[PDB]
Amino acid sequence: ETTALVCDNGSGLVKAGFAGDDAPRAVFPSIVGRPRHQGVMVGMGQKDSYVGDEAQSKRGILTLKYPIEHGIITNWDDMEKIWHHTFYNELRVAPEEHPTLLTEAPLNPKANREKMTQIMFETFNVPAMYVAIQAVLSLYASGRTTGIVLDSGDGVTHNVPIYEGYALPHAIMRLDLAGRDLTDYLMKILTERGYSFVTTAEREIVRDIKEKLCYVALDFENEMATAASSSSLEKSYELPDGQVITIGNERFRCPETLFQPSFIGMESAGIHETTYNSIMKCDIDIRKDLYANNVLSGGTTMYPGIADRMQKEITALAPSTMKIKIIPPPERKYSVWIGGSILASLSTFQQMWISKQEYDEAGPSIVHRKCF
Amino acid sequence: ETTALVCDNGSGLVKAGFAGDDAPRAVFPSIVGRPRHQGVMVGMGQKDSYVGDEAQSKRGILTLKYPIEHGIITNWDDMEKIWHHTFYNELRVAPEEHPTLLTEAPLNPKANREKMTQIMFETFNVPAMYVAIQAVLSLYASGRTTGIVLDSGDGVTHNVPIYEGYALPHAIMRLDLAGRDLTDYLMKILTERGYSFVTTAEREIVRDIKEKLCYVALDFENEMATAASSSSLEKSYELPDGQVITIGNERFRCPETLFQPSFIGMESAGIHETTYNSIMKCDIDIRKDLYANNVLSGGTTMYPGIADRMQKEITALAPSTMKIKIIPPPERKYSVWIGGSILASLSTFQQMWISKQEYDEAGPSIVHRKCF
Amino acid sequence: ETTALVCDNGSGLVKAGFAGDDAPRAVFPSIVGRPRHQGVMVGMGQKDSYVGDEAQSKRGILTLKYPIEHGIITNWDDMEKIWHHTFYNELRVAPEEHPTLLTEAPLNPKANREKMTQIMFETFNVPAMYVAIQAVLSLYASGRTTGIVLDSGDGVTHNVPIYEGYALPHAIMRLDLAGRDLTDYLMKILTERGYSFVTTAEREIVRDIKEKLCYVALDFENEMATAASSSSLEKSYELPDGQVITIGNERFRCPETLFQPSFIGMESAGIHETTYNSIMKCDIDIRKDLYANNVLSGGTTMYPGIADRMQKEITALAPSTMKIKIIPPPERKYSVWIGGSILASLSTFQQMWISKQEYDEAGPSIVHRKCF
Ligand SMILES: Nc1ncnc2c1ncn2[C@@H]1O[C@H](COP(=O)(O)OP(=O)(O)O)[C@@H](O)[C@H]1O
Ligand SMILES: Nc1ncnc2c1ncn2[C@@H]1O[C@H](COP(=O)(O)OP(=O)(O)O)[C@@H](O)[C@H]1O
Ligand SMILES: Nc1ncnc2c1ncn2[C@@H]1O[C@H](COP(=O)(O)OP(=O)(O)O)[C@@H](O)[C@H]1O
Ligand SMILES: [Mg+2]
């Protein structure tokens, strides 16, 4: 009868739907807005706070505030609000009937899972739930059983090396360089040309510019030398009001930070080094099989030409007597949700849900003992 | 109708097959491994422990453990498991019909044979069984009937002098220096160059390096002096992950342990002295015939140039007026199994099986009174 | 006239001083720091690299990097720099006059000692030098002459059984678990509570937390059970900027990796097992004395209550009819240097130095022929 409810709870977007499908049904930004002006107009259905896609449409008035920051939820009051919205106004189902499946980034605060389970068992009264790691669901979706995954969302970037089904918990690195940092860096470096973006609403415009105009350069120095005699690199974008801007070497300087994290003045290894370091933390016999299965998930890994530079850069580190392959699917943006649907549809998994009667016995602490 | 089922269940490898052939059918390592990680997957065909050549392919996960140590069985529970594997998954033959011939090392604990007979007669319900010594079977395979044999496997090294059909049980020396100590010594002296191997998985890599890169030097001092100006001795080996290691005078230092057991910190005489002492313990009238028949069996004796040094070394001890010949058959690695096949094929031997109804009357104590 | 210079150059700190004393004069962390920022300020005496305590004072800017890792020296250029620092800027003596006494861990790559000899005989032009083992020097300072020493520093942990003046080279175990691994594990498990430390500058902060706030539990299960109803276990530590942090059952979980190394997911026996296995590798006639003389040295062995658990754990392994004693001195942190001073002060030891004229004839290879 009832099957599941699979909702990937990212930092940027709330991707959600039913189990067993090939694509999520609801995809909206995870923001909640609150008005900040006089509001002298009468009627017109003025609500206290606009959440989801409606907030993005009217951003010129409200002050957007993301409830999820760096993967850790910090505004639980708004979080239950956005969950209520996605369950009622977007799917139009009763959450009390269908079990739900959730996702969380690894090495996360321990209280976060407890409070998530408590909220989903008290306010919504679901029958069952389960918390999964995104990096294993991506490899679920990819269809293989062994490999190393480089997830890269909006707030957190991490690796999980997994052999033929056996995870290695001591090789799970996690760096806090993600999409929001790139957006901030682009906003900062656009000032050199003359354009200044400050308001929370203009952060969305800068994010859109990054989404629709940025690419990863295969060779940074040669690209800079070419941009010195700037002929065919500059592009044009149209602001909502009508002004046209031109960005040149900012096109490939912004996404490079993933490879040279010193551009934001933080001493860390780029995404091409954390993968290699996480591979080198496993015992020697499996590095050959890990090298040949590199899976890219997450939205931030969707820049053009990222895979080519990842190959060209990792090949410089690994020994020369072996091959390296990266496996970017064209539909990686919903890889976590696809994997969650695949896991929820399985028959063997039906015994791993957390029953309500089980939770009443042991309290919210059951999540650590049962889920992982 | 039925002929036999002989399996040279040594310490290192389990060599098994049918009588009357010229080579065994199943040759696999005698290791049983158990995983050590949580296994976040689902399904994928889990066994609690992988036995035989399957475990050797997944050593990146498990903690391999040899059930047989120094010839003496220590972990019967896995011993019956690997015997079950041998009978079913590799030979595909019903043990309830074919009689089996087992082998053991001399000067072994009394309880070992008793437990072996009890397990074979209760768990597998064989009709007949018999336990023989490796050193006589290797001579049997060699085809002669008078000579002294130096067996050297993975856990035990021993000598058994045989005159014309008559053994000499009062002159059977046995030193516990074997291949495993050589592997550990190579692991220890490889740290001098810089490479450190610790886990059970890397012991296999070190063992393979020993197998395909070590040799026995005729004159140790001259070889060291040559290695002082190291030009044409060093070789290269490629590790599973890609790194290449170079080992120089570590090549001939490892297998010299058999000749100077003081390298591994034990007060004992080498294999070039135990054979001589065993020969000198027999009466004077057979030493001339024993000196001319030296049969080398077992895997450990497969180093290049071992026979030549053995000859040059025993010649120095024996009187100068008589000759020495060390017969090193080419296939000696399977000599014990060949001899077991020859012994089980013969018609005369068919009266010395231990019938099940005979075992019922007297219990498992029949093995000592009947086998030897 | 001239007496000696004992410079115990361990992995974590460089403890140095003169012979004949009861405590070293120089104790500073063994790091070298390099700036990474704009440096727009003029003057102020900005140096290229800060070495020693000065770097530890300005960690907010520099990128600290240890030149010695796991006892093996990897950055010789920085190592000679810190040697020049300790010789000139702290002791204020001319190295060309006084002889120096160095120390190193056993089972180290051969090239380390040779390069140490070359550096000390070419760059500084010392008259004579000698290299010792920490484990024997700690027993030397302890005052006895028969016992088993468990040295456990910052990079290496090794055991050396000693009978009445005769060392047993075939029973020197060595596991690579030390204080740095504990610091990394504490950094990783602090993220469960919510505190994230990534910067190399914050590793020092975590190390200070570990030094001043953690202890070894006698019974792990009972301590966890009491921590379930956490009342009197949490303690408060103040960060340099002003925030306070509170850790509960994290106080005793970090030092429990010494005894259960499976927490870092590496396959080795705990320090209570390597000592016992090293005892069991010796001949049967010295174990009774080895049991009753257990000497602990090194900084890592200074956790409160380590001796009680070590005794309770070794008693459970040894035969029940013979007694176990552990001898932790109150000042065991400097025991290696105290032993070095004692050894260099003696008159009989005067004939074992490596003379410069002797080194010229034979080159840097003399260390292996003379020292050990
Ligand atoms: N075409 C694109 N180019 C660059 N970045 C993109 C693009 N599309 C999405 N992104 C980035 O991906 C992120 C959204 O991914 P998301 O679905 O939130 O994954 P997760 O839910 O795991 O965080 C956004 O932060 C955005 O910056
Ligand atoms: N080519 C080789 N070079 C050196 N040693 C070898 C070689 N082949 C096998 N060995 C050694 O021989 C041993 C295998 O002998 P094995 O068949 O187990 O004798 P048994 O069955 O009597 O124990 C292994 O432990 C290995 O160390
Ligand atoms: N009070 C303490 N509690 C716990 N650990 C300590 C304490 N004091 C020092 N240590 C540890 O001791 C180590 C320093 O020992 P060290 O003098 O470097 O030995 P060695 O010089 O032989 O390496 C450091 O890694 C530190 O973690
Ligand atoms: Mg995602």
Ligand SMILES: [Mg+2]
């Ligand atoms: Mg053999």
Ligand SMILES: [Mg+2]
């Ligand atoms: Mg120390």
